[PDB]
Amino acid sequence: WVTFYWHWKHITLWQGNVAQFNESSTYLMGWLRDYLWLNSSQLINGYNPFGMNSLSVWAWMFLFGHLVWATGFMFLISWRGYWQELIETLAWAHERTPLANLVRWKDKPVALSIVQARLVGLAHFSVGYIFTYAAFLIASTSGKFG
Amino acid sequence: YIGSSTNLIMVASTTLMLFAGRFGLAPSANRKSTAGLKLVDRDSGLQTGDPAGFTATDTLACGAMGHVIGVGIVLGLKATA
Amino acid sequence: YFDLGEIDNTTGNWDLYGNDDPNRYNGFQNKFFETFAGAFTKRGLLLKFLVLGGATTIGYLGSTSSGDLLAIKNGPKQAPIMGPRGR
Amino acid sequence: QVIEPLNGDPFIGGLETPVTSSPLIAWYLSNLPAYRTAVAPLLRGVEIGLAHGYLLVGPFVLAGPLRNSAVRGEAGSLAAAGLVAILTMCLTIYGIASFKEGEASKAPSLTLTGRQKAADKLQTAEGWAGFTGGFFFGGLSGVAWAYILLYVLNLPYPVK
Amino acid sequence: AHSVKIYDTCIGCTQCVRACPTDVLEMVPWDGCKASQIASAPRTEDCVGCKRCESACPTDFLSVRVYLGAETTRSMGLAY
Amino acid sequence: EVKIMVEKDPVKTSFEKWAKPGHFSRTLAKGPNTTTWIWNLHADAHDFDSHTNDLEEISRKVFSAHFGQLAVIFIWLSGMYFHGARFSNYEAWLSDPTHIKPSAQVVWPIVGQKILNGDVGGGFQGIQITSGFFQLWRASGITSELQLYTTAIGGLIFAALMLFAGWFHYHKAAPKLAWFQNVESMLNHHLAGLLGLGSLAWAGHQVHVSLPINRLLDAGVDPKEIPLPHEFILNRDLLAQLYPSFSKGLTPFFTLNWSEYSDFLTFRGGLNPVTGGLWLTDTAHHHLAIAVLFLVAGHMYRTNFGIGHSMKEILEAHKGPFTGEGHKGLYEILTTSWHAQLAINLAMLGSLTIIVAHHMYAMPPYPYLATDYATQLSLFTHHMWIGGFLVVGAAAHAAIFMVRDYDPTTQYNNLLDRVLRHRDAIISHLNWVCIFLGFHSFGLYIHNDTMSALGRPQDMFSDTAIQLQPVFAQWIQNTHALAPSLTAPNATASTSLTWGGGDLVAVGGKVALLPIPLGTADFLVHHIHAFTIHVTVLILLKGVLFARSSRLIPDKANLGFRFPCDGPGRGGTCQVSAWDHVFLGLFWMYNAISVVIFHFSWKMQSDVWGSISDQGVVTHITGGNFAQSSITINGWLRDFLWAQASQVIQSYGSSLSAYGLLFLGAHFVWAFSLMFLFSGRGYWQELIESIVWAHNKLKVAPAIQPRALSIVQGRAVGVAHYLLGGIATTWAFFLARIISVG
Amino acid sequence: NRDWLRRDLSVIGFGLIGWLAPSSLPVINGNSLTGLFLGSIGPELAHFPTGPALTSPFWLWMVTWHVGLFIVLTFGQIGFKGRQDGYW
């Protein structure tokens, strides 16, 4: 919220029209449309079917954030014992598959523990959150300078 | 219409299926076909005047298989011949 | 199914797909492979020259590659794209 | 009538299905180089290397980044030989971790029947040592022979 | 592995033993309650750590208490 | 042995059981003591198996609950016909439907919401409806709003009849257990009496009412001067002027001259070029055929007349060498467990609703259905969401059958016992095919995103890059287009226009349907669909199979269905329950069905929906960008989630601004879901303890103790807000975009 | 073990005449010349040296003739073992 306010108060100051922020920041559709949608015009057009621009690494890092953040949901919503029974079935499948049963594990495959699950989902949430905004913020000001 | 081919099939499809249900050639209410398609006798409870076991259910059942088969023979021969 | 005379047969220690055939090749094919793969046997020795040999072989063709072989050694072939605000 | 438990034991986690104990499948799986328990493990590791070496030239010459040039034989074969050298080090560090020098064999000695057999020498520190060198020589020769039969002799095929 | 501790607030209601799925708890004689019995954990190395005993303990606060410590193949509940 | 078993006055119709809320459960009959009692009051309200152990009273409860549901649906249909009668422009839309949007909801001018009464056309202001009722009434032959009011009050009469029957079959004459266990009679009277006679009666309506009125509607006749539906029945010369086969008068039916009924009973196929909807001579031949086929299939089973099948004899003769004693006891499963029958019926109803969605965009059954794109998108999207919810509920009640009705003594060495005996193999091979599908579809998308980002368009999976053409689908679509010439002779045209038989149907200057192309993009998104359906099957089938026990928890059936966990032991046993697998399969249903409707919306906005100008040129809504942008996630975010969301966010100050409000509030409900999903009970319990301390300080402590929501309840609240918020987001975005560009 | 599917080498023969005797009769429905030499016309017409059939009429007949072969030549596998075992 802080850096949304900073980047939209400044992204309207730098190209002059502070009235866009003065009319649109009071309601959340202005935040969605005139900030999250309007400034993302040249972000997600960093690479197209027609070609790719210099913001393309910032267009991939934006999508990359939407992967990792959403991947955190996999650890923050789904919890342990589903994955523990799933890895139990996987351990049976490896222990009964011909030509692959010869390969052993020394570490017994278990699901991620509960604190570890919350930490991994939190760290994925944080990496996706910092990469979605690092990309959007460094692609919606450096591609449309002002 | 009496001598037409629609009447002669639908009479003979109904008559032969009622002949099969009465003379023990078709499944009926009082005799069951197993998985081996073998006619074994049963007591359905329905009582009529027939000594063989033909009841009011079978004359509706074999009339329907006189009609479901008989419609398909008539319209099968209509599209072909 | 518990026996107390054969503990492996009552627990699942079975060679399910194994074979007890001693040999099926001949002596000419067997002596060729052990001669050539004789310096590749020891795990500590094989891990040394695979790391040192693998680091050299990626640095050789990383550097001797041409413009058509890899685009990063080709460099730019057009005018640079100027950004907004004259930058 | 068709499905049996694994060697008559219902409490081992498996079944004697047709995909497991067929007359054809159990003949096949018993002759594959990984399940020969009396062959020396360098010799049978050359066959595990020749196979995997050969097959991997295909997806690296027909799908890789340099597939539309005249260097597609040279780029994809060294890419196929690169996956041999990585998996040799993956085979190297597996045998270092799993098996210790001077230990026994972590292998089932008993067969399908009640007859006692010798221990499988592949699951040892020295057996996986010679298996790793068998995969390295077999894999690098399996890549090079598939490169020779495709981009040196240039045999006619619908896709190459 | 897991350390299961019984405290002197126990009333000997036995339902911590009845809720135990790995046979950790047993009822030993005692002189501190009407039932004249307290729980104990001799086979605490077999404890998975499920705290079914803590869910079935009616004493406020709990008399049986499971502390999740070092976890081994007993307390991980594996079959492979 | 099949006969009526009821008994008289089981429970007295009294309000003293209304006053006690938790009367059905023994735990809730003591009154409240915490705030979790309110949530278990609603959680155990419909769970009739947890109330009593007697299946007879459970079956009576289910029967009267069915009647209450039928009363609710008839009240809903009464409302939608009353809204057509009084608050719609159905006569104005029926005069000309290519320019006037269907609208049947008027809002009250109170707080600025009167801007939502938009200019839908015909001198009318209101919410533009997308439910398809207008095209349904046009296909029913409804000409005036008096007929809509009559159908509304008739539905209210039937709703009162369902309420009376729900009271009657629980308090006056309720059936006994062996009445509900006559499943052969129930199938005989549902196949013949319900689906056979229902199809026959609707066929009679579509012979006498729908067909001549809809033929006059194709002739440009004004609906105020079209003769009323009973005038075709009365004056049969008026019916004979539209179809000369009516001049013979029922004599070709009983003399088997059915080809003389070829004027009004046809196997044409395709769409009406006047309206863009299927022919009603085909829809009347369809209903007459599925009626002469469901009535045949309703005479199959053995009730009490001797002829028929005992279905236990059908099942117990179906046994194989790969199974042994299979199919035995499944009759005892499906006649002593309501949840097993509920699982099968919910799977068939959800899969059937998905069949309905595909067989309505592709073969639009109603006049001007296809060219009103809002109706097509909303009907497909609604039926996909209902179908996904019902198949997740099918797996839910499958799992409830395992944890509460599966008797292992009666099921030895049958199919179900052996499926439980190798459930590790099923779940592991399903896990492998799910991971394989996940890489080979989504990693193909990631590869296309990477090489499009790295400036390598030739290294992608495009129609211009490495092609992945669906040769089986592209062959089955040619097989369904080149069918009428040899494999299906008697057809005038082809089944659907989306097959490849030409016939560019232009209705009102807008594209009804055309040949749908299938390329690399369709291959990739169909493999996404197969992957997501497979993963939803993986969580749901894992919850069904591991409902009894696991390698982790061997006594999981004693813990129940709605239990959270066993505890932090065995590494942590969080979400071991079968309920939690339904909970996760609800998310995977969101993922599956949302990508299905996203592929639908983009695929037909890019390749089907559009306009036709002069000289046969077709301009789509998003012209040709599905073949090049729907292969990357950046195209899906950019040319679908950003370009088509340029009408849901700037709809403010217009009639579609409620879609913007519910788009944003749907984002709110979704981010509100992430509060319940990511958090846990004990934190909120101690925060509530601090709030209870602040209440104790000011003597405003309630005697009903404030508690945090349960772990099963917290997951339920989180998945309910996740589905509600995300589904409402897609609803708002869809119903703003395709109304705006339609 | 080792007898998961017994051979009994007449079901492969009776299933062979189970899709030549009732499958090579000419029918008037659809004006077919024969039921299976139009299905065997794929080897007669679409057979090419390493240039195979693409967007072709071969794929349909084959997908029926084999489906009829995998519904009749396997129906004797039930039928012969149903006589051998206690099934009906």
Ligand code: CLA
């Ligand atoms: C007014 C007439 C009348 C009266 C006094 C009774 C008397 C009784 N009924 Mg009921 N019953 C009636 C009509 C009647 N019923 C009808 C019409 C039905 C068909 C639905 C039944 C079917 C029935 C069942 C199957 C059960 C009873 C039972 C009960 C007992 C108390 C249940 C309770 O708390 O009810 C109060 C319940 C409500 C207020 C809920 C009603 C919900 C209605 C149908 C509307 C639901 C949809 C609505 C639009 C809300 C949707 C959500 C909203 C936010 C939009 C009591 C003996 C129970 C019993 O004896 O078992 C112990 C039992 O299980 N009844």
Ligand code: CLA
């Ligand atoms: C030929 C007679 C016949 C027909 C038409 C039906 C029709 C129906 N049954 Mg029923 N049933 C019958 C006999 C019949 N039943 C037999 C013999 C058994 C006993 C073994 C059952 C026992 C059974 C149970 C236990 C339940 C049903 C249910 C259903 C409903 C299906 C659910 C739905 O939404 O459908 C569409 C609904 C409609 C189209 C509404 C139609 C309602 C009208 C008033 C007709 C119903 C009355 C009666 C059955 C037939 C009268 C015909 C009349 C029009 C002349 C529907 C009303 C289910 C239900 O919802 O319970 C209420 C339920 O699970 N049936």
Ligand code: CLA
């Ligand atoms: C034919 C339909 C059908 C049938 C008969 C039932 C029947 C039942 N279900 Mg359900 N089920 C189905 C389909 C169906 N379900 C589907 C669609 C799903 C997927 C969601 C499931 C998933 C499933 C699970 C996960 C479980 C059941 C269970 C229950 C039982 C009692 C639940 C209860 O008391 O209601 C409680 C009703 C509520 C709490 C009302 C809340 C409604 C939803 C969740 C939120 C509101 C949605 C609404 C549209 C949004 C409006 C917002 C607005 C108000 C602001 C009962 C056996 C439970 C059980 O124990 O079974 C024995 C349970 O554990 N169901």
Ligand SMILES: CC1=C(/C=C/C(C)=C/C=C/C(C)=C/C=C/C=C(C)/C=C/C=C(C)/C=C/C2=C(C)CCCC2(C)C)C(C)(C)CCC1
């Ligand atoms: C007494 C007697 C006798 C007689 C008997 C008889 C002769 C009988 C008859 C009977 C009959 C003769 C019967 C019939 C019946 C019929 C039926 C039962 C029908 C049904 C129908 C249906 C089922 C339907 C139809 C249809 C179809 C099929 C298709 C479509 C159309 C329709 C729908 C129409 C004798 C002489 C021997 C001797 C002495 C005594």
Ligand SMILES: CC1=C(C/C=C(\C)CCC[C@H](C)CCC[C@H](C)CCCC(C)C)C(=O)c2ccccc2C1=O
């Ligand atoms: C917020 C939250 C709670 C707390 C939720 C509560 C206490 C529900 C609040 C319900 C309402 C708002 C209180 C009851 C309202 C009464 C009807 C009184 C009416 C007062 C106004 C609403 C009019 C949990 O218990 C929980 C449990 C597990 C995982 C996540 C969470 C979680 O996120």
Ligand code: SF4
């Ligand atoms: S459950 Fe608690 S109170 Fe009861 S015996 Fe065990 S420790 Fe004591």
